[PDB]
């Protein structure tokens, strides 16, 4: 097989049709299903795989208690074909409390981060063997995209950050060839905080939309040049900003260059993508909690800082049902790159005190040129009934 290149144009998307759902938490109530969080989807040339950071335990288990902590020695990157729930036969790809993965066209690259908070190790595992590793450069929770990396002509790119979350962070973009780190670029341009980038191939470049945990409720864009490792960055101009928390749509605003400061602090991993000057994007329906999930196209919302003309709205999870992270992934169709996205559907602690564990289902949608209808595909588990 040749290295991936994504040279095909992006599909004429008119909205997202449903593609998959796991029911992991519904199955957990009578099954040995893994406790997870920070799930993501990535695909080899033949089929898609779901990944998640497993809390080193099944859900109906003593070890599922206090699984709300995001960093422990036991977290491992679970991998399955998409839709196969994470049952006990699931492969733990690597030790990891933060990670990213991507098939380069020849084999899987995983970036698996683990260790002490003050001194984490990132392990680059390519073709199923550890090829490289790099130590935390700012000694303050080395962390990565919690979603697919992107590879073009073999050079995978992964955005990694170190340093303070509610303050000025140090971010580097690692260029990886068959797991060997070939180059590293420090973040440049005007993005002031850059957590958890959802990347998508945008040949010849890779583009990523991230989480400003510090000052932006608008999302930062990182625009990465694979042929010369140059980085530039900016923000999602849409007046309908993608992060959570944010000001409501009546009062929110954005800037193409700066964090908009409006409810800037904290955030949620999300996504958006360009469609000429229009921007497709997905966000929680609520602006102060990760309840619901919606997607829409904002007319000129990629280029114009003042635009609030949404069109093609779709509820994916209604405003009563919890969501969580979400992330674009790209699927190479016959003659265009489709943009799919996933939504983590977090359940349990600390919002739902009815159970001792915290876990997630996922639901996955793909861009469609064809028509589509309506629905709501929440997690669906009844936490009043299942194991506390």
């Amino acid at each position, epitope marked *: 097989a040749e290295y991936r290149n994504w040279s095909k144009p992006q599909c004429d998307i008119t909205g997202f049709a449903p593609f998959s759902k796991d029911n992991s938490i519904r199955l957990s109530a009578g099954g040995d299903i893994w406790v997870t*969080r920070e799930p993501y989807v990535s695909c080899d040339p033949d089929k898609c795989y779901q990944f998640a950071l497993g809390q080193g335990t099944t859900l109906n288990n003593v070890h599922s208690n206090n699984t709300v902590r995001d960093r422990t020695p036991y977290r491992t990157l679970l991998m399955n074909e998409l839709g196969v729930p994470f049952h006990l036969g699931t492969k733990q790809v690597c030790i990891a409390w*933060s990670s990213s993965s991507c098939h380069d066209g020849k084999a899987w690259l995983h970036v698996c981060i683990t260790g002490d*908070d*003050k001194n984490a190790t990132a392990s680059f595992i390519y073709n199923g063997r550890l090829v490289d590793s790099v130590v935390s450069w700012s000694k303050e*929770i080395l*962390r990565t995209q919690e979603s697919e990396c992107v590879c073009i002509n073999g050079t995978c790119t992964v955005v990694m950050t170190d340093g303070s*979350a509610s*303050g000025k962070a140090d971010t580097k973009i690692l260029f990886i060839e068959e797991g060997k780190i070939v180059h590293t670029s420090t973040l440049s341009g005007s993005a002031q905080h850059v957590e958890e980038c959802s990347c998508y191939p945008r040949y010849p470049g890779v583009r990523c939309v991230c989480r400003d945990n510090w000052k932006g409720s608008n999302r930062p864009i990182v625009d990465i040049n694979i042929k010369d490792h140059s980085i530039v960055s900016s923000y999602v101009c849409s007046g309908l900003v993608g992060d959570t928390p944010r000001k409501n749509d009546s009062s929110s605003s954005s800037h193409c260059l700066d964090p908009n400061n409006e409810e800037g602090g*904290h955030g949620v991993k999300g996504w958006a993508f360009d469609d000429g000057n229009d921007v497709w994007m997905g966000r929680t329906i609520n602006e102060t909690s990760r309840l619901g999930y919606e997607t829409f196209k904002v007319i000129e919302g990629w280029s114009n800082p003042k635009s609030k003309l949404q069109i093609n709205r779709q509820v994916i999870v209604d405003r009563g049902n919890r969501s969580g992270y979400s992330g674009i992934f790209s699927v190479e169709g016959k003659s265009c790159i489709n943009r799919c996205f996933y939504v983590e559907l977090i359940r349990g602690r600390k919002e739902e005190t009815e159970v001792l564990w915290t876990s997630n289902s996922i639901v996955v949608f793909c861009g469609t040129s064809g028509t589509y209808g309506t629905g709501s595909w929440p997690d669906g588990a009844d936490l009043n009934l299942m194991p506390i």
Partner: antibody, heavy 127, light 109 residues
Framework: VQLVQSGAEVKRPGSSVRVSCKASEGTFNKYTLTWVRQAPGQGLEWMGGIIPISGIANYAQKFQGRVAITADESTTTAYMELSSLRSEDSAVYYC?????????????????????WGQGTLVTVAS | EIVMTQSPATLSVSPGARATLFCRASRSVSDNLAWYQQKPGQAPRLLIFGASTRATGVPARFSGSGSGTQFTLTISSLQSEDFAVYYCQHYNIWPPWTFGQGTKVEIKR
């Protein structure tokens, strides 16, 4: 729990000041240690704190890039060095425990409230 | 940055009587809120956390209530010990952990 701080300070502008806080045995393994300011007529103002396993320190917007907070379990003392002092910084500085044990890189901090406070160090900044 | 606001600034109240101190947040802080007493010149003293749980050293006469954007500290019968400044403070999810400008509970006569 008990905390005791360095005596009062008088300092020249542009200089630094290094307030110390000796906490009781094992404190830095259980509670985030934090520094909270009180300007003479004003309200309380958190400067930052240090996480009680990793020793990672997090600072408030107004002080980030000029305060340093550090701690040593050999002496169970924590220190705040405040740089580029100006008369605005004339305030009482309290060290305080924060119940927050841990930081989720996604969900932020739980329980960041201050059950135990040092006696407070008066810092004055004048020419 | 969430902005805490307290009223009234100077809650003048007689001894033995009840006092109630109001605190507002510029957005919902859930129940992630605390109240600190402060005698003139002493370090602050935690009274309430989680908007209603009393702290370790706190007598029955102090009780906290409310959730979301509005909160109240109730002082059921003031002893001479209680005339102090009271600071509100959120601890909801993310920095900065802003305090209120504080309410002075004066002795009314």
């Amino acid at each position: 729990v008990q905390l005791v701080q360095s005596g009062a300070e008088v300092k020249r502008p542009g200089s630094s000041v290094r307030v110390s806080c000796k906490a009781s045995e094992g404190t830095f393994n259980k509670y985030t240690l934090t520094w909270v300011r009180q300007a003479p007529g004003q309200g309380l103002e958190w400067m930052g704190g240090i996480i009680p396993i990793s020793g990672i320190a997090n600072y408030a917007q107004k002080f980030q890039g000029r305060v340093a907070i550090t701690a040593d379990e050999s002496t169970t003392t924590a220190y705040m060095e405040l740089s580029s002092l100006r008369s605005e910084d004339s305030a009482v500085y309290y060290c305080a425990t924060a119940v927050s044990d841990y930081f989720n890189r996604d969900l932020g901090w739980e329980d960041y409230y201050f059950p135990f406070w040092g006696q407070g160090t008066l810092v004055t900044v004048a020419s | 940055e969430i902005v805490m606001t307290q009223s009234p600034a100077t809650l003048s109240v007689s001894p033995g009587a009840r006092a109630t101190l109001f605190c507002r947040a510029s957005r919902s802080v859930s129940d992630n809120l605390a109240w600190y007493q402060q005698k003139p010149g002493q370090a602050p003293r935690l009274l309430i956390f989680g908007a209603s749980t009393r702290a370790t050293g706190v007598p029955a006469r102090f009780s906290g209530s409310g959730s979301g954007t509005q909160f109240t500290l109730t002082i059921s019968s003031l002893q001479s010990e209680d005339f102090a400044v009271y600071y509100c403070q959120h601890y909801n999810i993310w920095p900065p952990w802003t305090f209120g400008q504080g309410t002075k509970v004066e002795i009314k006569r």
